[PDB]
Design a protein around this ligand. Structure first.
Ligand SMILES: [Zn+2]
Lengths: 216, 204
């Protein structure tokens, strides 16, 4: 036990700015031997966590001075001096003063960057998929910012809402933009019955929706 | 340097027991405690135990059973759907912190099923976006590369969604217009559960 709580849960910050992540404990973290075993890790997507700071303010080999830990007893703080795109991920705090060692929930740090409109692309079903009886028509909305975007499928001007799957991408570590795939799947027959397949995206960077279609 | 060699994935039917290993190398095993942590997709991180004088977390009292010795194993017991998470082994001693790659343990009665890979070709522009559609696979864990992985600069891999009991996912890549179809790009999809590896050439 001993619950570690972090605040904030999501922390947006523009490049070059400072970022502060707070972790507080449900009990004092000062061991009877005088050490405070509070630690901070950074978990990047599809990777195990890596240590940044241990025992409140000591850096692990390699970790740059942008990162600094402070705190005492129950309140601890991770500060980042100049956020860089390479810094995005989920920061966790941990304590090993008390058994069982316990972790916090996470503070997903996300970069604030200039607005970007998505670049839509639509692809009709392949011959290969078609010969198997099904037909997925896919649409990619790549490299946009902010993550808020709405996609609409229209089959011959008629809106399609069932059978569509949408997947997002975490903020891209290279340019802080987001991406998304919308996939309308139908049978060969439903597909062969219609003509125009449209992918419409409403994103704030445009008053008028970005549309993309192909006629069969 | 310290290397903690762990299995990549494991699929087991609910109710069975599974024993995950962690091959320690690069250091004298005998000097540091071997820890274990569980992480469920939804971020959360939980400690399970250390070790052959084992010290456990009380919640995982009757689920784990640590053994050792070159290796340290963790045996989980009476698996449920809740038991599907990433399990790591680690040396968490202060300035000495090393984590294994993790072993994804999918607990399911489902049957492994290989992916169907369809190419997605479009036209005009200063660059062209192509992609592949990987559908029908189980369990997750599929890797999609472009040109044996030599094309990485503009690759967006989209998370796997669960459509009708089987996973689906797409990957996209954007190359300059003058290079396609002048040069072919091909996407490689590897589903290890079924020992599948299929390439798909991107033709107009
Ligand atoms: Zn129609």
């Amino acid at each position: 036990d001993v619950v570690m709580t972090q605040t904030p849960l999501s922390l947006p910050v523009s490049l070059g700015d400072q970022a502060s992540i707070s972790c507080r404990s449900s009990q004092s973290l000062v061991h009877s031997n005088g050490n405070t075993y509070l630690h901070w890790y950074l978990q990047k997507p599809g990777q195990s966590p890596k240590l940044l700071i241990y025992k409140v303010s000591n850096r692990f080999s390699g970790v740059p001075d942008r990162f600094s830990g402070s705190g005492s007893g129950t309140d601890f703080t991770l500060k980042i001096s100049r956020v860089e795109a390479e810094d995005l991920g989920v920061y966790f705090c941990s304590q090993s003063t008390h058994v069982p060692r316990t972790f916090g929930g996470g503070t997903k740090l996300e970069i604030k960057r200039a607005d970007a409109a998505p670049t839509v692309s639509i692809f009709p079903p392949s011959s290969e998929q078609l010969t198997s009886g099904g037909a997925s028509v896919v649409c990619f909305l790549n490299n946009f910012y902010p993550k808020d975007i709405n996609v609409k499928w229209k089959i011959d001007g008629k809106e399609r809402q069932n059978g569509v799957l949408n997947s997002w991408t975490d903020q891209n570590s290279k340019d802080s933009t987001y991406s998304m795939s919308s996939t309308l799947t139908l049978t060969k027959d439903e597909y062969e019955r219609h003509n125009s397949y449209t992918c419409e995206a409403t994103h704030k960077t445009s008053t008028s929706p970005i549309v993309k279609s192909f006629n069969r | 340097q310290v290397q903690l060699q762990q299995s990549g994935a494991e699929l087991v039917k609910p109710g069975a027991s599974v024993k995950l290993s962690c091959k320690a190398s690069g250091y004298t095993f005998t000097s540091y405690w071997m820890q274990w942590v569980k992480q469920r997709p939804g971020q959360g991180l939980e400690w399970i135990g250390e070790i052959s004088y084992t010290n456990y977390n009380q919640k995982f009292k009757g689920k784990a059973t640590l053994t050792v010795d070159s290796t340290a194993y963790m045996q989980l017991s009476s698996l449920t759907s809740e038991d599907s998470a990433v399990y790591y082994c680690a040396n968490l001693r202060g300035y000495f912190d090393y984590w294994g790659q993790g072993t994804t343990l999918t607990v399911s009665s489902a049957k492994t099923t290989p992916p169907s890979v369809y190419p997605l070709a479009p036209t005009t522009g200063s660059s062209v976006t192509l992609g592949c559609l990987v559908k029908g696979y189980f369990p997750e864990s599929v890797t999609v590369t472009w040109n044996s992985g030599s094309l990485s600069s503009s690759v967006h891999t989209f998370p796997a969604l669960l459509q009708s009991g089987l996973y689906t996912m797409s990957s996209s890549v954007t190359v300059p217009s003058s290079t396609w179809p002048s040069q072919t790009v091909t996407c490689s999809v590897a589903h290890p559960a079924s020992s599948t590896t299929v390439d798909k050439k991107l033709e107009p």
